[model samples]
Target chain A: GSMCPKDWKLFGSHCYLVPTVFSSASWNKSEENCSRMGAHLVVIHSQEEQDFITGILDIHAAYFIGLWDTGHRQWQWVDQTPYEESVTFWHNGEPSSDNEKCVTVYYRRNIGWGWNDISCNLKQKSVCQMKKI
Target chain B: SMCPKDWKLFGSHCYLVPTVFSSASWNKSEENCSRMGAHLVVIHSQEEQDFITGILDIHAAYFIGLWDTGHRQWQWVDQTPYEESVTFWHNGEPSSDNEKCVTVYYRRNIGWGWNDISCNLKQKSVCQMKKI
Candidate 1:
């Protein structure tokens, strides 16, 4: 009964876009914006879904993809999909950060790049998700 | 000072590097290794990393026993935790930053590094038989 919003397209059954991350939304703060749009940061559920969203990483190549492995114990995500070796697609020896609490995906090879755990204050664009309009 | 007939000794352990699409995936490889009285190599230090990488054919890669249970952490197949600071990754490594399987990288110049990959995708696997 609704249509996809500006710039966001219907992939599968959801709407997605590279939302502008301004006001320096820290990991937690930016998520608030996505919530306002009836969305949240991108939650990689499947490779097929990931391929559809990963192809368009604009300038600043690195974008936040909802990961926070405080190195405390686990890498927590907004979608609650636990990041484990059996389920994720890290490049190789990653998570090179010691103090970084936020996660970022950048242009390493292509849109199908891996992620690094970086500082939370690092300002980068974010991918947002919303229900199908 | 004895080792397996064709096996090589490095650091403190004797290794058998089977440069073939030997065992299937991590789990399968591990089972096969155990049957042979060996386990996948668990990397602990960059020194060992350098040592292992040096012996590789620079053209062959294999599966190590490192894996995760969707737990966001890594551990060896024989129950050893990933213990290291300096590591090796491909261009856009840890692809999703969430891969669960581990592979050894072998190239011409700087051949030894670690890469997370799909566990079920089979390839050559490395096994460690005995240790001190």
Candidate 2:
């Protein structure tokens, strides 16, 4: 009998499995892949989830998530939640301009965590998605 | 008694004024200028208004406005309105990828109008704001 592996731990009520560790894709393509898998990229809903994922993943460069600039204004989470302004964890003088729309997390050796905007097309390690069972 | 000038037409209930023309500044600086002038840059609403303003201002590189990414998912307009999901005029396969934020309009000779983006790092003309 085949049973699904216990949802890979990342966020509670959510599961992530990296399909291929070496290959990376753009934001749009990555998101498409997640969709094909019946899930969207990782969506961090709380601090607990953020810390949990950060602990497990290796932070060499930033990776793609479900978030993207739809051009309207607000961001759309895979879960379809409304954008929350107060929930952001921006670094000092961050989100400097509009060109910096796509975001990825950065881990400073001693300074802790922050985010940076990069071209969505650039390839990097990607995170997979699964729903809580 | 001194009466303020009618809000310079740009978007409804908003006014804009060109303070100086020769020099340009980065997005942050441009936003600061609008802040000092008691107004933010022009926010286009309707096709009618877009056409109206298009007739008046000279088409050039883009100008700065109150819109900026505040390290959150959505954009922040000057009026403090919540971001809308459906109001966008993206070009074909528009929003190609991230890092193309800070949109600006481009005037094609015969093919109608479109938007292009450059590094918000560069300086360009600016827009002003006034309360409606």
The model with the greatest TM-score is 1
DockQ of each: 0.02, 0.01
Provide the TM-score for each candidate, comma-separated.
0.45, 0.45
Q: Give the 10-residue window scoring lowest on summed lDDT in candidate 1 chain A.
A: A80-89
Q: What interface RMSD does every candidate have?
A: 13.1, 14.5
lDDT of 1 by residue, B21-82 (tens): 35576656664565456777767777766766666666666777776556546666656655
Q: How close is candidate 2 to the true structure, as a TM-score?
A: 0.45
Which of the CAPRI classes, incorrect, acceptable, medium or high, describes model 2? incorrect
**Cα-based RMSD of the predictions, in order?**
16.0, 15.5
Q: Model 1, residue A53: displacement in angstroms?
A: 1.6
Candidate 2 achieves a global lDDT of 0.49
Runs with alpha carbons beyond 4 Å of true place in candidate 2: A1-7, B1-132
**Model 1 chain B worst lDDT window (10 residues):** B19-28
Q: Write the per-residue lDDT of candidate 2 for residues B10-35, one digit (tens) a residue.
A: 43443333445343333333434433
